[PDB]
Design a protein around this ligand. Structure first.
Ligand SMILES: Cc1ccc(N)cc1C(=O)N[C@H](C)c1cccc2ccccc12
Ligand SMILES: [Zn+2]
Length: 315
C-alpha cells in the first residue's frame, strides 16, 4: 500500500517548499538528512500527525544552497546538522527573565552562553546573517533556544562543552556590522620614540591585557623590543562599545563605571562563568539565580563598556 501526506521542507524556516512524501519510505530515503524541531528523523518514516509541519533538510540542490548561504552567511555543509543537533538540546533549556533580561537555567556547561546572551542584550550589536537577527529578536522576548543553538553552530561547539566568552564573542563579532568601528593607539618607548596604529572592525573593540578602560586611556606598560617598558594608551575610540579582557584576576567593579562584566571562577577550560551587570546597583546574574550588592570583588576576565566617540587629552 502507498498512502501520502503533505509536509513543508526548508533550510531557513522562511522559504517553505511543499513536498508530497511516501509514508512507505523514510524521510532519509526521500530527502536525505531530515530534522523536525532539531530531532534527526532520517531513519524515521512519516506519521499522520506530521501532515502540515515544517522539516529542515540539507541544502542538496542549487536553490537551497543559495537560500542557506543568504540566511546563515556560511557554506560549511556540516553547519545545519550541528545547528539541528544543538537546537534539539537547547529547546529543553529553561530561559527565565532574570533582572528584566533573558538568561539560561544552568545545564550542559551553558554558563558561558548565559553571560554571552545577557551581554548581547546590554550592548548595541547589529548581526549580518538574518539567522542571528531573527533568532536574537525571539531571544529578547524569552525564546532564546534558536539563538543559543546558532551560537554553538557558528562557534563549532557541541552541547556540554564549556566555552570561552571572549572566544565566543570574537566569533559573533565576525558576523556583526562593526564596519565603521575605529581605534587609534599610541605606543611610547623612552629610547625608540612614538608609534601610532589604527585598528578597524573586531580589532577596534577587543583588547586582551587589562580590564580597566581608564588604565587603557591613562596608559599600560608593555615590553618593547628595546628590552625597556613602553607605554600604550588609547588616542581615539569610534565604536558603540569596547570589550576589555584579561586572564581571571581579583578585580573591584564600581556601580556606574561599566556596563557588564564576565566573572570566571575555577581553573582553565573547567570553571564557572557569572554575569555582573551595573543598573541602579550591581547585580550578579548566575543563570536563573540573582544576587544584588553595592560593592563587588571577584575574579573578572571581561568588562564591557558603552561608547560613542572618545578623544584623549594627554600630551
Ligand atoms: C572556559 C574556557 C573554554 C575554552 C577555552 N579555550 C578556554 C576557557 C578559559 O579557561 N577561560 C578563562 C577566562 C581563562 C582565559 C585565559 C587564561 C586563563 C588562565 C587561568 C584560568 C582561566 C583562564
Ligand atoms: Zn623601546
Amino acid at each position: 500500500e502507498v498512502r501520502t501526506i503533505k509536509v513543508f521542507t526548508t533550510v531557513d524556516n522562511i522559504n517553505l517548499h511543499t513536498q508530497v512524501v511516501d509514508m512507505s519510505m523514510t524521510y532519509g530515503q526521500q530527502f536525505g538528512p531530515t530534522y523536525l524541531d532539531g530531532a534527526d528523523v532520517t531513519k524515521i518514516k512519516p506519521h499522520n500527525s506530521h501532515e502540515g509541519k515544517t522539516f529542515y533538510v540539507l541544502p542538496n540542490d542549487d536553490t537551497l544552497r543559495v537560500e542557506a548561504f543568504e540566511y546563515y552567511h556560511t557554506t560549511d555543509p556540516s553547519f545545519l546538522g550541528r545547528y539541528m543537533s544543538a537546537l534539539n538540546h537547547t529547546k529543553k533549556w529553561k530561559y527565565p527573565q532574570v533582572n528584566g533580561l533573558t538568561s539560561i537555567k544552568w545545564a550542559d556547561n551553558n554558563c558561558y552562553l548565559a553571560t554571552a546572551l545577557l551581554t548581547l542584550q546590554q550592548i548595541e550589536l547589529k548581526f549580518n546573517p538574518p539567522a542571528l537577527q531573527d533568532a536574537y529578536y525571539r531571544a529578547r522576548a524569552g525564546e532564546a533556544a534558536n539563538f543559543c543553538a546558532l551560537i554553538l553552530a557558528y562557534c563549532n561547539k557541541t552541547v556540554g562543552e564549556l566555552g570561552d566568552v571572549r572566544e565566543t564573542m570574537s566569533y559573533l563579532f565576525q558576523h556583526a556590522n562593526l564596519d565603521s568601528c575605529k581605534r587609534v593607539l599610541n605606543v611610547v618607548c623612552k629610547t625608540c620614540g612614538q608609534q601610532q596604529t589604527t585598528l578597524k572592525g573586531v580589532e577596534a573593540v577587543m583588547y586582551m591585557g587589562t580590564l580597566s578602560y581608564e588604565q587603557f586611556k591613562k596608559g599600560v606598560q608593555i615590553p618593547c623590543t628595546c628590552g625597556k617598558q613602553a607605554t600604550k594608551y588609547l588616542v581615539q575610540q569610534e565604536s558603540p562599545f569596547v570589550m576589555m579582557s584579561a586572564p581571571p584576576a581579583q578585580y573591584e567593579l564600581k556601580h556606574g563605571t561599566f556596563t557588564c562584566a564576565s566573572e570566571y571562577t575555577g581553573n582553565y577550560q573547567c570553571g564557572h562563568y557569572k554575569h555582573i551587570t551595573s543598573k541602579e546597583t550591581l547585580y550578579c546574574i548566575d543563570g536563573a539565580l540573582l544576587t544584588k550588592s553595592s560593592e563587588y570583588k571577584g575574579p573578572i576576565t571581561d568588562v564591557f563598556y558603552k561608547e560613542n566617540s572618545y578623544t584623549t587629552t594627554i600630551k
